[PDB]
Design a protein around this motif. Structure first.
Motif, PDB file in Angstrom:
ATOM      1  N   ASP B 654      43.921  33.354  51.945  1.00 56.75           N
ATOM      2  CA  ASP B 654      44.288  33.776  53.300  1.00 56.75           C
ATOM      3  C   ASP B 654      45.769  33.490  53.516  1.00 56.75           C
ATOM      4  N   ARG B 655      46.498  34.504  53.908  1.00 59.04           N
ATOM      5  CA  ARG B 655      47.963  34.361  54.029  1.00 59.04           C
ATOM      6  C   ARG B 655      48.399  33.421  55.167  1.00 59.04           C
ATOM      7  N   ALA B 656      47.627  33.391  56.249  1.00 56.98           N
ATOM      8  CA  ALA B 656      47.814  32.477  57.399  1.00 56.98           C
ATOM      9  C   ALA B 656      47.322  31.050  57.069  1.00 56.98           C
ATOM     10  N   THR B 657      46.089  30.903  56.594  1.00 62.25           N
ATOM     11  CA  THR B 657      45.504  29.574  56.449  1.00 62.25           C
ATOM     12  C   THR B 657      45.690  28.920  55.119  1.00 62.25           C
ATOM     13  N   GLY B 658      45.951  29.645  54.034  1.00 64.43           N
ATOM     14  CA  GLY B 658      46.007  29.018  52.748  1.00 64.43           C
ATOM     15  C   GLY B 658      44.623  28.849  52.159  1.00 64.43           C
ATOM     16  N   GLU B 659      43.551  29.133  52.903  1.00 62.74           N
ATOM     17  CA  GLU B 659      42.192  29.035  52.333  1.00 62.74           C
ATOM     18  C   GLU B 659      41.897  30.006  51.182  1.00 62.74           C
ATOM     19  N   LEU B 660      41.211  29.507  50.174  1.00 64.85           N
ATOM     20  CA  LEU B 660      40.787  30.254  49.003  1.00 64.85           C
ATOM     21  C   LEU B 660      39.663  31.195  49.436  1.00 64.85           C
ATOM     22  N   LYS B 661      39.843  32.502  49.234  1.00 68.34           N
ATOM     23  CA  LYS B 661      38.792  33.479  49.581  1.00 68.34           C
ATOM     24  C   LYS B 661      38.105  34.025  48.320  1.00 68.34           C
ATOM     25  N   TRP B 662      38.886  34.305  47.289  1.00 72.64           N
ATOM     26  CA  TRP B 662      38.324  34.866  46.045  1.00 72.64           C
ATOM     27  C   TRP B 662      39.142  34.491  44.835  1.00 72.64           C
ATOM     28  N   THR B 663      38.524  34.729  43.671  1.00 76.80           N
ATOM     29  CA  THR B 663      39.216  34.757  42.417  1.00 76.80           C
ATOM     30  C   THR B 663      38.966  36.083  41.705  1.00 76.80           C
ATOM     31  N   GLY B 664      39.904  36.459  40.852  1.00 82.14           N
ATOM     32  CA  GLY B 664      39.842  37.672  40.093  1.00 82.14           C
ATOM     33  C   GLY B 664      40.621  37.644  38.812  1.00 82.14           C
ATOM     34  N   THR B 665      40.300  38.550  37.892  1.00 77.06           N
ATOM     35  CA  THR B 665      40.926  38.674  36.600  1.00 77.06           C
ATOM     36  C   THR B 665      41.931  39.816  36.676  1.00 77.06           C
ATOM     37  N   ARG B 666      42.632  40.029  35.582  1.00 81.71           N
ATOM     38  CA  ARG B 666      43.546  41.184  35.486  1.00 81.71           C
ATOM     39  C   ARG B 666      42.811  42.506  35.705  1.00 81.71           C
ATOM     40  N   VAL B 667      41.600  42.574  35.181  1.00 80.58           N
ATOM     41  CA  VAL B 667      40.770  43.819  35.304  1.00 80.58           C
ATOM     42  C   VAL B 667      40.475  44.077  36.756  1.00 80.58           C
ATOM     43  N   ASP B 668      40.160  43.019  37.518  1.00 76.85           N
ATOM     44  CA  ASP B 668      39.956  43.165  38.948  1.00 76.85           C
ATOM     45  C   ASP B 668      41.163  43.627  39.692  1.00 76.85           C
ATOM     46  N   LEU B 669      42.256  42.923  39.456  1.00 79.07           N
ATOM     47  CA  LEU B 669      43.433  43.142  40.304  1.00 79.07           C
ATOM     48  C   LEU B 669      44.266  44.336  39.935  1.00 79.07           C
ATOM     49  N   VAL B 670      44.080  44.905  38.764  1.00 81.65           N
ATOM     50  CA  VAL B 670      44.836  46.088  38.395  1.00 81.65           C
ATOM     51  C   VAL B 670      44.564  47.231  39.350  1.00 81.65           C
ATOM     52  N   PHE B 671      43.368  47.224  39.971  1.00 81.87           N
ATOM     53  CA  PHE B 671      43.017  48.241  40.952  1.00 81.87           C
ATOM     54  C   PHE B 671      43.855  48.164  42.239  1.00 81.87           C
ATOM     55  N   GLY B 672      44.459  47.007  42.492  1.00 80.49           N
ATOM     56  CA  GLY B 672      45.303  46.806  43.667  1.00 80.49           C
ATOM     57  C   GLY B 672      46.761  46.792  43.256  1.00 80.49           C
ATOM     58  N   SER B 673      47.039  46.994  41.952  1.00 75.96           N
ATOM     59  CA  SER B 673      48.409  46.979  41.454  1.00 75.96           C
ATOM     60  C   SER B 673      48.963  48.292  41.011  1.00 75.96           C
ATOM     61  N   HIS B 674      48.274  48.905  40.106  1.00 79.18           N
ATOM     62  CA  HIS B 674      48.667  50.162  39.532  1.00 79.18           C
ATOM     63  C   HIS B 674      48.601  51.252  40.634  1.00 79.18           C
ATOM     64  N   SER B 675      49.622  52.091  40.714  1.00 82.96           N
ATOM     65  CA  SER B 675      49.795  52.909  41.903  1.00 82.96           C
ATOM     66  C   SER B 675      48.762  54.050  41.947  1.00 82.96           C
ATOM     67  N   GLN B 676      48.344  54.538  40.778  1.00 85.22           N
ATOM     68  CA  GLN B 676      47.255  55.502  40.712  1.00 85.22           C
ATOM     69  C   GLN B 676      45.922  54.935  40.914  1.00 85.22           C
ATOM     70  N   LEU B 677      45.609  53.806  40.302  1.00 86.88           N
ATOM     71  CA  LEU B 677      44.350  53.142  40.567  1.00 86.88           C
ATOM     72  C   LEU B 677      44.211  52.709  42.047  1.00 86.88           C
ATOM     73  N   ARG B 678      45.288  52.220  42.634  1.00 90.76           N
ATOM     74  CA  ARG B 678      45.237  51.772  44.024  1.00 90.76           C
ATOM     75  C   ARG B 678      44.984  52.947  44.906  1.00 90.76           C
ATOM     76  N   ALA B 679      45.546  54.091  44.571  1.00 90.05           N
ATOM     77  CA  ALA B 679      45.286  55.322  45.395  1.00 90.05           C
ATOM     78  C   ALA B 679      43.774  55.660  45.383  1.00 90.05           C
ATOM     79  N   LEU B 680      43.121  55.472  44.215  1.00 91.63           N
ATOM     80  CA  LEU B 680      41.713  55.674  44.112  1.00 91.63           C
ATOM     81  C   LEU B 680      40.934  54.624  44.913  1.00 91.63           C
TER      82      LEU B 680
END
Ligand code: HEM
Ligand code: HEM
Ligand SMILES: NNC(=O)c1ccncc1
Ligand SMILES: [Cl-]
Ligand SMILES: [Cl-]
Ligand code: NA
Ligand code: NA
Lengths: 713, 713
Positions: B654-680
């Motif tokens: 959480d950007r305000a609280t610092g509380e841990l909400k989730w964990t993820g791997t590269r496979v998870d987060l590539v969907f929020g990184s790569h500009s084509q995958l994120r569009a999907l």
């Protein structure tokens, strides 16, 4: 991972023709964006965007509490990549969210602007495209700050992958001119189709040409780049002064504090870039261009303070905290507000390129008129902002929603409304018969209709056969269009049209635009019949005839085909191989590789070549629609050699006898050279392919005839 | 033309998932090759091929008046690029006619072989693919020369563009080992997934390892490369000795006489390459490999002379006219015929790699047995030639025409015939209800059916849920398959199956293979219902259960998923980033980018991760089928950072609280990184997309369930 590009760097690349497949599109194959958008509650979207303008997020705090200037800059960058030379770039596909534009240096921190918009995109989903949203957001920023816009049209469908655009040959971001891949030559002549001064910029360098802070010389770059984005002096002054009425630039600290652009950032950045180590990295400490200029005393409100300041002070050269050249009014009081500290004030500042508006003699006259008459400034700016953000949207029939302006503008290549019943299937059959009885040949009919329809380009959706502009200046005198033969064809078609219209009841009449296309269809029908096949070529009426007075001759110049491989035509000698130009033209006509292949092979045997050239006419039954092109091309009994006279022309000789059978160009023979194109040619050259060739030809012919028919969408 | 590749070489390339689109394919979207081929008159094609064998063309005269050896080499090159590690390469797509394989140095002059076949291709058109044609032509060459083949199956559909295959990292053709991009490390260990010793070779260097003429060391390269193409020692000896019973090599003059490979040649070469300046450049003067060896006394007829010569002489090292290392028989007479001059004869000669068959101790035993028992030689070679040329064709249900061998071979991963009535829709409902009543969870049902189905790869059409091989060695013990959890699921499914089967009339029964898939479907149904959606998942019965004896454990090892992003699984630490392995897996499963995206996001919330990992499980309602993955991933209120313990794992706070909400791997987060995958991801994370996510999920789930179901084609 060593690739085909690495091994064979000058082999033609066909993958540009197979972008935008159903495979990369997440929306169902029947999804229709226009129908989604037409049901969007646009008013509700605009209210949410209004609220957004002053709802600051801590990860990218809003300057002066208002994101309006950031979003105007975002929507100007979206639209600002447009080039008139090929119609590529612009806002109309939302390409700012993909590589490489998302990571151009000039787009720094627009990744934050786009992220601010995600909650609204998410709320409305497929009913508003990103492409439409970026522009609407700019309009709403304007409106929230007291500026009345000219209108807004929806209908820009999202795309799902990067377009392949030639942005230049430089290998270094922002490389100064005169490098080994210089985009300039001669007396500062920018290479077509480029419309910016350095790789990664929208138009010009804000410090001045190659960083030299001379406002006079900067004005020359401004004028040239904006002209290559279809803006004249008046529009350019209005646009730059209009935009710099809002917001500020960002250069709080040295540029070396700024990290990797989005495509190079770590995965954890989640699509954002330019992370800064300078103090808080954001807000008061933001670094975007390295300049630190705030133009007006009310950066969140429409005003005429940009010109009041520009003319009301004398300027001196200075440096930002990042070391970039900029200008300050040193004789001035601290009347400009700080973006975050209510107890700080600053002197008025300007970019070198802002001072261009005052120190270029032609711009000065316009800027003075705008200064003295800010209502003229407002109107010119609104009109230009509409034109900027809509230039690549194509015909007015694609404009959706409730804010489309009623006024018809000359830049839109307007087509008059049809106010009479259209011809039916029986009438179309009668006219085709009359066309064929007039004596016009298969060659003349096909050439004329190809000439009219093939000006279309999908990049900006300009051109095509609607309007019958082939009969008007300048299209009627383009060399590729064979002006004397064209004039004779048109004269005969016009007499057929007058006779048919004069015999009607009930108001029914046919346009010349429709008849030119229908006559091309008769020609293709007759060619099929010459080869023993009865086919009907589909035909959709409803085109109308635009007048000369509705046709901007100068804006039409960019549509002249100087290379058209489909007519074996090259206007002069180019550094780019002709087969590359063929693939480029195919891309602009929206054709796949198979469609290009079939179309070219048929055109060749129908007599569509400019000047009646024999090049690539590999048939003894010209004006019959057969697959002869492919059968003779692939015949291993013929051996090919470049001519002594011309290395771009080839002789095909019988391998046994030495007898000359044919001649051809690089455009012809690439179909027998390139391994993917030859595979295509083999399909159409096979003994079971006569019917498939004719059917696929007719389908691609029809597709080209209908490219601009958004009235039927 | 500076590209996205040039700017960002470590940005994931998704275009490999969007190859083989309808756009590049000239055939209709309804064209079915199996149906075209089933109507081909195969006997007539074979007659024409027999005639071709001795119809010499002047532009590439036939050695000994017979093209048979040239065509055998052509067909063994077509099949010979196959790698068991990913199933890529091989003959099954006719990739020899496209880049880069058409221009591999090892395929020199196979461009002429394929051109000789154009008249036959052209005559029969779409009813025989190039891919089938190359193999058939090899079979006919064998038959024409007195060797009876084991059979032939058609059904290899043509492709229309290059596949993207990793052939290695070297930037020089044929580069020897130990260079900056060496494909070898350690004790001559070839990097997976490669199955050749140098860039541009089929398997090994015919002079010896890196050009060193040591037959013993060559044999090690032979064994390793052939094993990586699915051949054991017996098959390897049979293939090499079988092939080199025919024809000859070509090295009449220095290799510097040979010009540009086809993709580099001029346009006038019309798709051909390696034009030679040596004498006539062809026939007696041919230069192909640089070696000059003719193996037998009757190069156009099947014989037992390869082994007679290999054992009957002692060999001396010598050089060809091009300077290559090769071997000549000590003291022999000139008993080998010349290819063009009836008055010339030559001594027996051999490649270093031929001598491997004699001087490797294990090969020597097989070669001696073949020498002493030529009938066993002939039968082994026939079997291996059939396996070579069919190993990538997939299940027997894809084999077409009248020459399919009836004998079922272990390498085909065979599946028994179904000989009983299948379950109907009412039985399927009953079984799903029993599955859900047993207590098996959504997570167990989905994970098990995913495990069973997702072994499929489209490269060679091996794997998938047919057979129920998940219950057999080695699949039941694969780490990714969670052996202990799997055994408990299978035990419960097996009891449900036995009870259902025991209650039937008329011989109706359900296979475990079908029940595993049906149970996965019930799980997806239950998950949809947990989220308030009423979903029926399609199910097609008809799988059968293969036995252990029908399942080669060693050949099955290459299908083990060592990386499966769909289960957030990585078996060890690899030099290839995990997101790259994800795209690779998606490609083998035949998924587009949208399909990969939707599938992964669903599997995450259904509990399909290996070991119950929380990574990427961005939901508070696990085992409910929702679009939570996307909505949470794209939430800007969360900031992501690599962990201290592991840079490939990320914490979302959480950007305000610092509380841990989730964990993820590269496979998870590539969907929020790569500009084509994120569009999907944005489509599926939008407020209007919950039903679209569910429907698209079900569709891709069902696609994966049916990937191997060629009995339903
Ligand atoms: C000669 C043409 C132009 C040049 C060289 C230019 C240059 C720039 C530069 C360097 C910045 C600062 C970026 C930053 O550091 O945050 C900027 C800001 C801006 N420009 Fe332009 N500009 C041009 C034309 C335009 C036009 C045509 C518009 C709109 C109609 C526009 C609207 C703006 C706005 C609203 C901002 C403020 C951004 C904010 O408040 O964050 N400019 N301009
Ligand atoms: C260790 C494996 C192998 C090596 C290193 C190898 C090497 C070669 C080389 C260098 C040539 C000469 C190319 C030329 O200059 O024209 C050749 C020809 C040939 N090989 Fe192989 N080979 C191998 C395995 C095979 C197999 C498995 C087959 C078939 C089952 C095969 C059948 C042929 C035939 C028929 C030719 C003669 C071509 C003609 O007559 O034009 N080879 N081999
Ligand atoms: N490189 N070729 C393959 O991976 C493939 C081909 C066809 N379907 C799936 C995968
Ligand atoms: Cl574009
Ligand atoms: Cl492949
Ligand atoms: Na455009
Ligand atoms: Na394969």
């Amino acid at each position: 991972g060593t690739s085909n590009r690495d091994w064979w760097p000058n082999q033609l690349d066909l993958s540009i023709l197979h972008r935008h497949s159903s495979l990369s599109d997440p929306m169902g194959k029947d999804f229709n964006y226009a129908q989604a958008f037409e049901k969007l509650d646009l008013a509700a979207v605009k209210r949410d965007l209004h609220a957004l303008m002053t709802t600051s997020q801590d990860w990218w705090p809003a300057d002066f509490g208002h994101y309006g200037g950031l979003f105007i800059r975002m929507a100007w960058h979206s639209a600002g990549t447009y080039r008139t030379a090929d119609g590529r770039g612009g806002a109309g596909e939302g390409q700012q969210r993909f590589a490489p534009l998302n990571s151009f240096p000039d787009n720094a921190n627009l990744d934050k602007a786009r992220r601010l918009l995600w909650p609204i995109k998410q709320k409305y989903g497929r009913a508003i495209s990103w492409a439409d949203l970026l522009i609407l957001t700019g309009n709403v920023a304007l409106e929230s700050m007291g500026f009345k816009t000219f209108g807004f049209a929806g209908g820009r469908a999202d795309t799902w992958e990067p377009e392949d655009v030639y942005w230049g040959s430089e290998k270094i971001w922002l490389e100064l001119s005169g490098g080994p891949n210089s985009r300039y030559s001669g007396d500062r002549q920018l290479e077509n189709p480029l419309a910016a001064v350095q790789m990664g910029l929208i138009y010009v360098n804000p410090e001045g040409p190659d960083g030299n802070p001379d406002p006079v010389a900067a004005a020359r770059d401004i004028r040239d780049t904006f002209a290559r984005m279809a803006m004249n002096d008046e529009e350019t002054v209005a646009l730059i002064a209009g935009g710099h009425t809002f917001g500020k630039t960002h250069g709080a600290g040295p540029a070396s504090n700024v990290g990797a652009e989005p495509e190079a950032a770590g995965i954890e950045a989640q699509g954002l870039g330019w992370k800064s180590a300078y103090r808080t990295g954001k807000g008061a400490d933001a670094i975007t261009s390295g300049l630190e200029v705030t133009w007006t005393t009310t950066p969140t409100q429409w005003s005429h303070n940009f010109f009041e300041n520009l003319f009301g002070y004398e300027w001196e050269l200075t440096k930002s905290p990042a070391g970039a050249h900029q200008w300050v009014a040193k004789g001035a009081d601290a009347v400009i507000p700080d973006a975050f500290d209510p107890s700080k004030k600053h002197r008025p500042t300007m970019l070198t390129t802002d001072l261009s508006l005052r120190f270029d003699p032609a711009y000065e006259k316009i800027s003075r008129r705008f200064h003295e008459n800010p209502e003229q400034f407002a109107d010119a700016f609104a009109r230009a902002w509409f034109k900027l953000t809509h230039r690549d949207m194509g015909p007015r029939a694609r404009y959706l929603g409730p804010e489309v302006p009623a006024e018809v503008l000359l830049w839109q290549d307007p087509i008059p409304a049809v106010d009479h019943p259209l011809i039916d299937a029986a009438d179309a059959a009668e006219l085709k018969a009359k066309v064929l009885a007039s004596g016009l040949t298969v060659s003349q009919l096909v050439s004329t209709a190809w000439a009219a329809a093939s000006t279309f380009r999908g990049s900006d959706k300009r051109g095509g056969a609607n309007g019958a502009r082939i009969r008007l200046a300048p299209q009627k005198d383009w060399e590729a269009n064979q002006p004397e033969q064209l004039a004779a064809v048109l004269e005969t078609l016009e007499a057929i049209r007058t006779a048919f219209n004069g015999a009607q009841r009930g108001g029914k009449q046919v346009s010349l635009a429709d008849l030119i296309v229908l006559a091309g269809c008769a020609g293709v029908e007759q060619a099929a019949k010459n080869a023993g096949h009865a086919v009907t070529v589909p035909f959709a009426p409803g085109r109308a005839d635009a007048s000369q007075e509705q046709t901007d001759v100068e804006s039409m110049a960019v549509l002249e085909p100087v290379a058209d491989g489909f007519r074996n035509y090259l206007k002069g000698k180019y550094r780019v191989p002709a087969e590359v130009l063929l693939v480029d033209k195919a891309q602009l006509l929206t054709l796949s590789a198979p469609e290009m292949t079939v179309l070219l092979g048929g055109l060749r045997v129908l007599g569509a070549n400019v000047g009646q050239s024999r090049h690539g006419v590999f048939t003894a039954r010209e004006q019959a629609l057969t697959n002869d092109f492919f059968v003779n091309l692939l015949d291993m009994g013929t051996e090919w050699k470049p001519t002594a006279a011309d290395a771009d022309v080839f002789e095909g000789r019988d391998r046994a006898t030495g007898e000359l059978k044919w001649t051809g160009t690089r455009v012809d023979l690439v179909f027998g050279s390139h391994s993917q194109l030859r595979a295509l040619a083999e399909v159409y050259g096979s003994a079971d392919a006569q019917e498939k060739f004719v059917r696929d030809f007719v389908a691609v012919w029809n597709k080209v005839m209908n490219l601009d028919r958004f009235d039927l969408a």
